[PDB]
Subunit: 210 residues, 4 copies
C-alpha cells in the first residue's frame, strides 16, 4: 500500500514549500502526472461546500476558513482511505467565488508515497491514524506573520491582512492547530530553508522508492 | 523614601501606554507625586563609528549594550535617596546627549519603564514592585508594523528584515528571560483596564 | 453588590494558598463567621454527583476529576448569581466515597468580597462573566509537579510511581487541554504563588479599599 | 571524513536512550570495540578539572555542573576535530567526586558515524559548527522531572527533597538559561524520546545509508 505522510503546521510555516521541495529534490516534477511515484495533497483542496447560512457569514466576511468546521473532514477521510486501498482518487477544485466545487476535478493516480499537508491534518483522529509518518513544521508565529504579510501584499491591503490575522488566524491557529503538534513523530523547524531536514526526509522516501 | 516601580515588557507590548494611562488616571499630568522614567532616555552616547552603523540601520538599539546601565543604576539610587536628579535628553540626530536636561524632583512614586528594566540585578533590586507587560510576539509585531509604517513612515521590508535580524533575537535573549523576575504580570497591555486600575488605586493608597 | 473575584491556576500553582493568605492578611481569620467580609469559595466543593457509569470508572481510578465534566457548572452558576443578589447561599459538601453530596451543607453569609477559586474557574463564559476581576496563578508545570509530589507522599501517603503515573495520565493532559487555555481571560497573572508577597499584598490592599 | 551527529536536549529528555537505541538497532552492540562504525560520545565525559575555588563551591554543594563553565570546551573541541582528522582518540573519565580526570581513559578508534550527546552540545559555536546534523530531543519539563525523580531515587538512594531542591535551585535555571535556547540551532526536533520509534527509525536508516 502507499506510504502516507501527514504534514502540518501553521500557515506560512513552510509546510508547503517543504513538501514542494521534497518532491522536486526527488525529481518528481520531471515525471508525468500519470506515472508519478510521489504526490502532494493539500487540505486546502477539501474545503466544505458551504451551506446557505455559512455563505451568509462569509458574505459578511465573518466565516473563519481556518476553523476545523471549514474542512470536509469526512471527504478527507474517505479520500485517504481510498488511496490506501490503492484506488485512484478525485481531488476537487474549489470555487471560492460560489463556495462550492467546480465540476473540474484533479486525478491522482495511485502513488507509492503520499504527502498530505494542511493546518489541521492531525486534528481528526481517523485522519491522523492513516498517516504512517507525522511531521509538524514548527515556526514561530513571529516569523510566520512576517512571511504572511510579505506574501499577501506582494495584492492585499496591509490593514486588512493584519486585521484578518489578529481577528481570525491567530485565534484559530492557537486553538486547533498548535495543540496537534503533540501528534508529530518528527518536528521540522523553520521550514523550506532547513536543508538538513528536507534531505533527511527525501532520503527516507527514496529508500522506500527502492 | 520614593517607592520605585519597575515596568518591563517588549516594545509595542503596551508598557509605555500603560504607564501613561496610570499617571493620566491619577491626573498627575515640580509638584508631581508620581512620575515616569523611561529607559529610552539613557542610551549611550554613540561613537562616530557606531553612528555610521545607525544611519545604515546597522545599530541594535535593543541590545543591553545600547543603554548606559551605570547612569541608570546611579540615577535610580539617588532617586531612592530622595535626591532630585537630572535625566538626560537624548538627541538621535547626533546620537549624543543634549546640553539641556530634564529635572525630576523627589516624587513619592517613580515608574521606571524599559525593555530591559529587569536586566541588571542591581537596578532590579531597587524596585519595590516589578511589573511585566506581556503580549504575544504575534500581536506585538502587528502593532509594531502598523506603527512604524503609519506613524514613522518606514519601508515594510526593512521593518520585518530588521525585526527578524535584530529585534526578535534581542527580545528573546535579553528581555523575555527577565519576565520571571516580575511580581505581577499584566497581559495584553493598555486595554487591560482592570489591571491598570489595580496599579492606580495602589499608587493612590501610597500617596495617602 | 458583592465584589466577585475569580481565581484560577493549576493544582499546586498556589492559588489556594494565595486566597488563604489574602483573607489572613486582612484579619478576616479574626472576624466572626456571621460577619466575615471576604470569603473563599472552591470550585471543588461543587463536584458533580456522578452517574452509575462515572462512579464505576472512578472506582477503577479512571475518571479524570480534572475534566470539566467533573464539575457541576449549573449549580456553580446558580449559587454565584444568588451571591450577586446579596442572598445567603448554601454550599454543598462532597463525599468522595459515595461520590455524591452529604446532607450537611455549609452556609455562607453575604460578604462584601468573594474569592471563587478553582482549576476551571474561567472555563464557562457565564460563570466567568460574573467575576469583576480575573486572577490566574501561573506556576511552571515544573515547580507545580515538584510541589505535588512532596505534598502527596507526606499527607496523601501515596507512593511516587502512583503520584507520577496519575500526573502523566490525568493531570497534565487535563491541565493543558482545559485549564491552561483559560489563562487568556485573566486580568492579572500572579506568578509562582503564595510566596509572591508583592502580588499578595496588592490584591489585599485593593480589597480593603472595597471594604472601605 | 567521519559524519558527526550532535544530539542535545535536557537531562532525562531521552537523548541518551535515543542514542543508545540507535546504535542498538544498528547492531553495533555485537561489534568489537575496534570494529565499530558508529559510536557515542557524552559531553558528560568532558567535565572540566575544577580549580581550588570551584571545588570549594562544589564542596558546599554550590557548583552548578549544568552550567556551561562545567564543561571543557577545549578538550571537546580538540577531541572532535581529531576524530574528524580520522585520528584515534582517548576519552577522559571523570570522578564527579574529586572533580578531576583519572589517568584511566577510554579508547575510540576512527568511526564513520559519531554521536556527540549533551545538554550543552550546541552551546559553543566552535563545537556546534562541526556537526553535520544537529538533533534536539524535546521533552516537556514536567515529564522530564518525572523520569529524573524515578531514576535518581533508585540509584543514589538520594532523599526526594534533596533531588527536588537541587532541581529547582540548579537544574531548572540552568536548563532554561542555557540548554533550551540552543534548540533553535537544531536541524531536527525529536519529541518525547526513546519511545518515538518513527523518529528513531528515521535516524537509524539515514545512518545506515551513510554506512553504504
Amino acid at each position: 500500500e502507499p506510504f502516507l505522510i501527514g504534514v502540518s503546521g501553521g500557515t506560512a510555516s513552510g509546510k508547503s514549500s517543504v513538501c514542494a521541495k521534497i518532491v522536486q529534490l526527488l525529481g518528481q516534477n520531471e515525471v508525468d502526472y500519470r506515472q508519478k511515484q510521489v504526490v502532494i495533497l493539500s487540505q486546502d483542496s477539501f474545503y466544505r461546500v458551504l451551506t446557505s447560512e455559512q455563505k451568509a457569514k462569509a458574505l459578511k466576511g465573518q466565516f473563519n476558513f481556518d476553523h476545523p468546521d471549514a474542512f470536509d473532514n469526512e471527504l478527507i477521510l474517505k479520500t485517504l482511505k481510498e488511496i490506501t486501498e490503492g484506488k485512484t482518487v478525485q481531488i476537487p477544485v474549489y470555487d471560492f467565488v460560489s463556495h462550492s466545487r467546480k465540476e473540474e476535478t484533479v486525478t491522482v493516480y495511485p502513488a507509492d508515497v503520499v504527502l498530505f499537508e494542511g493546518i489541521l491534518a492531525f486534528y481528526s483522529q481517523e485522519v491522523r491514524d492513516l498517516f504512517q509518518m507525522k511531521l509538524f513544521v514548527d515556526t514561530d508565529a513571529d516569523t510566520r506573520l512576517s512571511r504572511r504579510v510579505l506574501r499577501d501584499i506582494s495584492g492585499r491591503d496591509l490593514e486588512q491582512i493584519l486585521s484578518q490575522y489578529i481577528t481570525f488566524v491567530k485565534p484559530a491557529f492557537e486553538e486547533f492547530c498548535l495543540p496537534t503538534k503533540k501528534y508529530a513523530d518528527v518536528i521540522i523547524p523553520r521550514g523550506a530553508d532547513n536543508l538538513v531536514a528536507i534531505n533527511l526526509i527525501v532520503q527516507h522516501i527514496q529508500d522506500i522508492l527502492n
